[PDB]
Amino acid sequence: SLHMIDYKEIEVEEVVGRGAFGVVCKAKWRAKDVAIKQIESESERKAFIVELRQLSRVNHPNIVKLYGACLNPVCLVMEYAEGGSLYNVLHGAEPLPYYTAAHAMSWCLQCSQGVAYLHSMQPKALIHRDLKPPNLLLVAGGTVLKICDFGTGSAAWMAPEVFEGSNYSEKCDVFSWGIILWEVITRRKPFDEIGGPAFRIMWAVHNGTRPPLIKNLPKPIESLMTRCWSKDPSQRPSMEEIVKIMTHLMRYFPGADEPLQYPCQHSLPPGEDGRVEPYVDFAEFYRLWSVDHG
Numbered sequence: 001s002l003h004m005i006d007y008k009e010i011e012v013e014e015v016v017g018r019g020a021f022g023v024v025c026k027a028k029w030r031a032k033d034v035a036i037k038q039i040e041s042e043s044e045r046k047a048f049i050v051e052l053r054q055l056s057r058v059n060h061p062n063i064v065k066l067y068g069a070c071l072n073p074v075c076l077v078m079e080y081a082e083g084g085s086l087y088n089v090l091h092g093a094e095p096l097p098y099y100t101a102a103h104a105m106s107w108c109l110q111c112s113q114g115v116a117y118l119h120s121m122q123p124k125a126l127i128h129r130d131l132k133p134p135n136l137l138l139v140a141g142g143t144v145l146k147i148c149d150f151g152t153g154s155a156a157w158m159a160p161e162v163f164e165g166s167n168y169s170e171k172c173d174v175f176s177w178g179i180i181l182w183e184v185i186t187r188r189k190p191f192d193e194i195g196g197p198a199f200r201i202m203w204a205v206h207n208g209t210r211p212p213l214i215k216n217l218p219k220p221i222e223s224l225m226t227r228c229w230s231k232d233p234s235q236r237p238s239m240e241e242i243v244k245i246m247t248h249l250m251r252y253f254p255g256a257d258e259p260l261q262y263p264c265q266h267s268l269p270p271g272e273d274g275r276v277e278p279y280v281d282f283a284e285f286y287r288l289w290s291v292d293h294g
């Protein structure tokens with residue numbers, strides 16, 4: 001369900017960055033901004049095709065919309081995400097934006113909403129396999145999140161059974177989502193302290209290492225997070241369950257529709273002594289929670 005496009009109708013504006021594969025650049029098309037992805041080397045052709053056939057089947061507000069695909073120089077034509085990537089908002093530009101507990105929870109809810117749609121696909125469920133903030137885009141002033149890069153570095157978000165070579169299911173995305181939840185709450189890069197080549201993270205995670213626990217994290221959120229981290233994929237919740245849980249929790253996180261507009265100088269202190277401080281503040285959550293339960 002595409003819509004063939006002629007390159008001459010595009011007219012590029014400027015390169016904005018590289019995706020998981022290929023290059024992305026802003027462009028105009030029929031009186032509206034556009035992002036187009038082209039393959040640099042022909043080795044990326046396989047990824048180009050799979051993403052083409054997969055994105056043609058998806059239609060969800062939390063997944064990047066694919067308009068068409070031109071085969072003259074071979075490129076995908078998608079919607080432009082003005083807000084950039086979530087990874088950039090979290091750890092990127094020199095003037096970093098302030099965000100609240102409501103934004104963090106809202107972002108993770110919207111991500112689970114999109115993945116739940118993929119996992120519900122018929123005949124076969126669609127697994128993303130590369131869920132991480134670099135592949136999550138933001139629009140509407142940083143309020144709306146959209147999943148991108150369906151072509152399938154990423155070791156910090158990968159379930160052990162995946163790089164274990166073992167067979168895996170849709171539950172590998174659940175593991176990645178859990179890491180993302182920890183990441184937005186702490187505004188820390190997962191396993192940044194380990195570093196080195198990728199196999200050093202894989203070894204740690206394979207032996208059961210997980211990101212440190214979060215001081216004063218509400219037990220309902222801690223439970224969900226650590227369940228997603230389970231070694232055994234069958235002990236992880238389905239995305240449908242995560243959506244339901246996160247939806248119910250948002251009752252205690254008002255203000256997710258407030259755009260990102262304030263800067264901050266995120267200090268990020270080196271204090272990984274078992275526990276870790278959250279970046280967001282859960283004071284209001286505990287207050288609103290006590291109102292209902294009392």
Ligand SMILES: CCCn1/c(=N/C(=O)c2cccc(C(N)=O)c2)[nH]c2ccccc21
Nearest residue numbers: 016017019035064078079080081084148149
């Ligand atoms: C990695 C993010 C690159 N980037 C960006 N991407 C997109 O609009 C986009 C849209 C659809 C699909 C994809 C993809 N990867 O399949 C990407 N918009 C940006 C605006 C400012 C700075 C960087 C930007």
